[PDB]
Amino acid sequence: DRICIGYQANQNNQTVNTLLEQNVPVTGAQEILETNHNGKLCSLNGVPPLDLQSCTLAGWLLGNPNCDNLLEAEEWSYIKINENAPDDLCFPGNFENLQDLLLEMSGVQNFTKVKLFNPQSMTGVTTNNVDQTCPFEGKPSFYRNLNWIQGNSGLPFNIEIKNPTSNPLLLLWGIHNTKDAAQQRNLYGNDYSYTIFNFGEKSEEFRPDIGQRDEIKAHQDRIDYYWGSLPAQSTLRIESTGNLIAPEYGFYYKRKEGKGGLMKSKLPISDCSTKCQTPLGALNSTLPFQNVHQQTIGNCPKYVKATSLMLATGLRNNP
Amino acid sequence: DRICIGYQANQNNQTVNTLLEQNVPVTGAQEILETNHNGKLCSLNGVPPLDLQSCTLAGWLLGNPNCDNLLEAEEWSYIKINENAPDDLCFPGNFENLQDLLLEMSGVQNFTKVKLFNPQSMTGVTTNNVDQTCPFEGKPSFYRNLNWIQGNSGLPFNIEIKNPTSNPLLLLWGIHNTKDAAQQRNLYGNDYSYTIFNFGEKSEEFRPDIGQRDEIKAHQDRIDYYWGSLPAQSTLRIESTGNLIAPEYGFYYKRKEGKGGLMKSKLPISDCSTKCQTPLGALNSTLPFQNVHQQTIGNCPKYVKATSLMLATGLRNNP
Amino acid sequence: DRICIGYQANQNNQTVNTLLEQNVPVTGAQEILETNHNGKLCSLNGVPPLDLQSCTLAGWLLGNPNCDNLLEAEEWSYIKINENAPDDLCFPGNFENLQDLLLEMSGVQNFTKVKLFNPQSMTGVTTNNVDQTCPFEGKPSFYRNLNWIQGNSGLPFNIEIKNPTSNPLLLLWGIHNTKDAAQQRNLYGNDYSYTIFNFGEKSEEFRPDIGQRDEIKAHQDRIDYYWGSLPAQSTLRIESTGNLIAPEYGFYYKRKEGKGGLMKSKLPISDCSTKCQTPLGALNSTLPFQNVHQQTIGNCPKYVKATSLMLATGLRNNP
Amino acid sequence: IAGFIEGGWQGMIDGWYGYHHENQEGSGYAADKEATQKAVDGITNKVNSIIDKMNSQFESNIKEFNRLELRIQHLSDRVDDALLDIWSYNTELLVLLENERTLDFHDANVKNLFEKVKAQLKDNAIDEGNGCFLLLHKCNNSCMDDIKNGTYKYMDYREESHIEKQKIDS
Amino acid sequence: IAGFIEGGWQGMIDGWYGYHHENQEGSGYAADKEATQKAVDGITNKVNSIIDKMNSQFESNIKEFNRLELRIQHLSDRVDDALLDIWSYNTELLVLLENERTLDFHDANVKNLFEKVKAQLKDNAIDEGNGCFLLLHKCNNSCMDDIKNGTYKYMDYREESHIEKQKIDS
Amino acid sequence: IAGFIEGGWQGMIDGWYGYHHENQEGSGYAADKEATQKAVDGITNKVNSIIDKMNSQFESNIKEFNRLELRIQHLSDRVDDALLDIWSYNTELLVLLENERTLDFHDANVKNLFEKVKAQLKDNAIDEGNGCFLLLHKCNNSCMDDIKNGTYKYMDYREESHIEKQKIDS
Numbered sequence A, B, C: 001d002r003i004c005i006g007y008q009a010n011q012n013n014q015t016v017n018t019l020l021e022q023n024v025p026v027t028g029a030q031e032i033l034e035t036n037h038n039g040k041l042c043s044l045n046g047v048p049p050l051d052l053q054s055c056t057l058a059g060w061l062l063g064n065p066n067c068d069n070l071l072e073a074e075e076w077s078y079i080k081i082n083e084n085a086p087d088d089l090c091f092p093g094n095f096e097n098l099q100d101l102l103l104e105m106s107g108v109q110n111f112t113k114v115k116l117f118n119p120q121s122m123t124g125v126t127t128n129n130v131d132q133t134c135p136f137e138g139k140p141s142f143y144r145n146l147n148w149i150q151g152n153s154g155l156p157f158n159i160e161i162k163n164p165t166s167n168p169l170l171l172l173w174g175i176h177n178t179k180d181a182a183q184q185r186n187l188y189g190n191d192y193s194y195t196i197f198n199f200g201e202k203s204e205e206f207r208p209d210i211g212q213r214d215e216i217k218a219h220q221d222r223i224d225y226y227w228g229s230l231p232a233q234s235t236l237r238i239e240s241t242g243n244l245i246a247p248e249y250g251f252y253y254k255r256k257e258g259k260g261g262l263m264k265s266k267l268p269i270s271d272c273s274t275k276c277q278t279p280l281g282a283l284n285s286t287l288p289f290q291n292v293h294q295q296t297i298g299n300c301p302k303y304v305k306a307t308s309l310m311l312a313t314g315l316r317n318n319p
Numbered sequence D, E, F: 001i002a003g004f005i006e007g008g009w010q011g012m013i014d015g016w017y018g019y020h021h022e023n024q025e026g027s028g029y030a031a032d033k034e035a036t037q038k039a040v041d042g043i044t045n046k047v048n049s050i051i052d053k054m055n056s057q058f059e060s061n062i063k064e065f066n067r068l069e070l071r072i073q074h075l076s077d078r079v080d081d082a083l084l085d086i087w088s089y090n091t092e093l094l095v096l097l098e099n100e101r102t103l104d105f106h107d108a109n110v111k112n113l114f115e116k117v118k119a120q121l122k123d124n125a126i127d128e129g130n131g132c133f134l135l136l137h138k139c140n141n142s143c144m145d146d147i148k149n150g151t152y153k154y155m156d157y158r159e160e161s162h163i164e165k166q167k168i169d170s
Ligand SMILES: *[C@@H]1O[C@H](CO[C@@H]2O[C@@H](C)[C@@H](O)[C@@H](O)[C@@H]2O)[C@@H](O)[C@H](O)[C@H]1NC(C)=O
Pocket: A074, A075, A109, A110
């Protein structure tokens, strides 16, 4: 007559590592490292990404005639970035401070186009000037959101824009860099011009950079494209005597602090939702670590270079 | 007749957490997380902060007529920042590179105002010109530390500044941006001017940005404000033919490496001293962690998001 | 008749620290903190550093006449930096964006000088102009890699550079900043000039900054030195009507991602090789921590401020 | 046949720790429910703490278009490596250490069973030293059950046991 | 009445670990000063190491005025989160683990007392298995004191004890 | 003369854990090869894991020429301190904790030897409580060797031992 004290052993084939031994068989264990995605770009806590498809972000905001599609996305949780999107700047030129503009627009909340002035209030000037290089419907046109102003005979003109909101106001405009003095006098009626932005006491004077560039799309002149954000309850006063392509429409917006982001991904947008997103797909992030991708957006398990992390829960499985 | 082996139990109501159990009662334990401030802005290892009260840092250094108060703070361990301080730039304009200037002046050691040249040595020019927009005592004046030079009839003039010290020399100056050519010729006797800073071989050419801004404080012209630091045993040579508001006084200084900082706080300066300072107050930093504030200055416990961290020291308190 | 159970004790004098005790004697232990260098600057995984000796990096790339020595280092794993190297810019001026250029050239793989155009193809202009301030052999000369172009009578001239490679192309050039209008008309035949770089649609217009600086090396004019990298399969078109010191030779290169670096060290280059390099010397980096230097290049043990870290391996040595 | 000293039992399928008994009426395995359940609560607590306590901040990362600004590039790249080294090394060792403890925990738990039983039997049984006890008296099912319930009475079998001891001695 | 197995004693107010004794002259608690003191030195060392070893660098932080430069903003903000995650998670688990060990340390210490006593008494006492010993001989204060000093003499009470054993057997 | 309880032995020079024996033919030390070897494999594993698992990223650092851009300077300087605090504090405590465990490991290993021997001898020997056993029968070299091999036979010395017990009792 005997009685013995013993413990469970089992058919389980999992092994684990410890300080003192390698690959010790156990009756049970738990993976604490997430190692698979879902291969889709998803909305993020139910807020979807911005999908510009064939347009650039700059093209879209300027109001390129080819971007006249996606609906007024009132909000977005991050931006799907396209590296080669055909529809960008129709009139050739430079865009000043794109990277900061992308960071500003990376995740935003209320986003509404707004009119900033009437060109048909203006006197002794021509407005809505047009070019072949930005065509609407076979007919020459221009950016939806900018107004090209000309023919002021070297005389000054003005525009007050206001932001009456408790939220910022995004502005885009351009300076026309003419090909020689001959064209400078033709359009604006002088050899040289100036444009001044007044933000109360602060000021900026833009002058055009005259001279002939390479011919591109039949043009040897260029436009330099600018953006700025105008703060809550705030006014700017612009005076120019030429070369200003003025800001007709802007956008009220609100940025979220832990701000969205920028994703370069081959994958297409999906109906699905997640808390954590990578260029490779989305993650079940209830686990504390992951080895899928270093570049993530959201609430994410930490990235580690392990191939797995088994926590023992059971007992040494020696039958 | 018996003898038993046993252990202490107690009236202590502290509990602690462990890997295997939640809230286990113990006979004694220790908080290792600091969780309270003192609600004051203090000096830091006995070196006090810089308190500009109603002046801006720019206003102060330029020598605004309204800043003519705080004593020559020979040193400071960080800066109390005011967001709306009335006394800033009296003559309207732009300040170039404020954020770097704040970082430079964030914690400094020996700080002495020094004269850089005599205006009354100069010939064929008027000096000490004055304006209503920077008034002394109802009478019009100008910045204490800058000298406005005019009336040179388009002819060049010069200024060597020297730093003979083994420590840096802080410089402030301005360029007058005139409202039109008419005023350009009135003051400086030409259509256009140039000002050149020579630091041995290196050089900088400033030209004014002519044109009319918004009228502010009765002015449609502006000044652009600049700063620079001149290194030990070093010389600059300035030549200008106009539009230079010159640097008359500067400051020798020495920056501390683990440099002070910038504090936005509502609290007022206090007589008290500490090793660690936050916008919420100061910290008894003999503990290794704290949960008061993420933004600290000095020798500080690490910030964690725990509500407390109890180390058990005693025994399981099961009576 | 007895039998006892016991353990080893020993003559070993090492002690170790633990949670519960200080300096407990043990029969054996292991240092896991590396604490000595080899006092030499070494090549890094068999790729040596760049050693410019008496030249500056700028001097070298421009093709200063005094740098005409080191062989075409086809590659290097990092740069030994000299703080006072005499041979830098022979014609006095400014170098624009040095820190980014140093970062770009910090570790590179295939590095071959390449010709970008023929000056003797050009018409109605003089090329290869020369100065005393950049002497070859007592006779006046100019930078090897730049060509100074003059005497165009205010008429425009052109240069296409191509990068036909699948790797970047490094470019250096200069803009001549003339001392007054008199010299402007003498050299280039006009009061004012322009130079335009066209990178497809993108463009840059350089204009010279006229006026007299301090006289240095018999000169009151200056040159501003520029660099740029031209991407794979890419073209720039340059048009200028003056003041361009043009780019005659460039360099194909390939940057390594975990890029080399910049080392300030007093030590001289050595034949030796290592995986981890510091300003103090190289490290046997098979250990996980080191306390030699915070600033390292390569595959390095982590820096900690401990004086040693003894792991116990043996037993409590109580005889 | 043998106890924990020689390994674990395929046969016991209703818990972690328990007994194997041998008598005239037969034999069988029985898990000690109380001691098993206590260990399960604890291990679950450990695992849940290691998982649930990782509640991380909203991050977002940038893979840019940028031989444009560099100094920030390089700083961002150095920071990503630094973080990577930290989490990889620490959490590798964390798993190694925590696993060690878990296994020790189970060993400690099993020995406790043995010690609790041994203390009841004293010299009414012979410690075979392999995790089994040879009883010096006959043991029916109620006897065995008393040991498993911790209610075995030392006095009540003392006399039958002492005779058997002296028989061994002769 | 009962020993460590059933819990700790309200009554013992002069230290961590000790004894409760029962005889004809009376009863009382007595802390084992040497074993208590040794544990206190050690726990203090642990706590002090966890506190004193945090000797941190002079830092300073920036809450700026700045939709001006951004790329650096965003990098600074990502870095603050990263650090926060590191310290929060690691130091949470640190406290959890260190607390576990401390409690094990105290359990190990108490069992050692019991084992040290048991080894002196051998079969002159009966291990009741609840942390108490029933002595098989009469034990005056000097007897009890000898056990607490570790100087109890096995031989000197052997004979009185053996008779009592055989009485149990009858 | 005395066992592990009073400390370790200068004399034993061929391993970590072992025995000291005393009989008529003489005396001597002998390391338990199997138990030593097992512990060595394990400690080597621990040390190697702590060393080999640190496989770090290609880094590089900058000590610049730079009262030029500052905001990045300051950020880079704050980051270097942050990393420094992390590694210094964590790895200090890591060494402290790991050292603690190593020593416990060795203590646990030695007690196991004692427990394994004790379980073979039972009442054929008297636990002196200092890590030595006093045998109640005469023990030649083959007897001693059987204990060290774990093959000592309890039954075969039972009778000689029991007489000696009752002699003690008289
Ligand atoms: C801005 O938007 C917040 C969220 O709006 C809701 O979700 C988005 C995606 C839309 O579907 C919208 O129509 C929903 O109402 C609002 O909570 C908030 O009111 C808005 N704030 C302002 C100032 O417009």
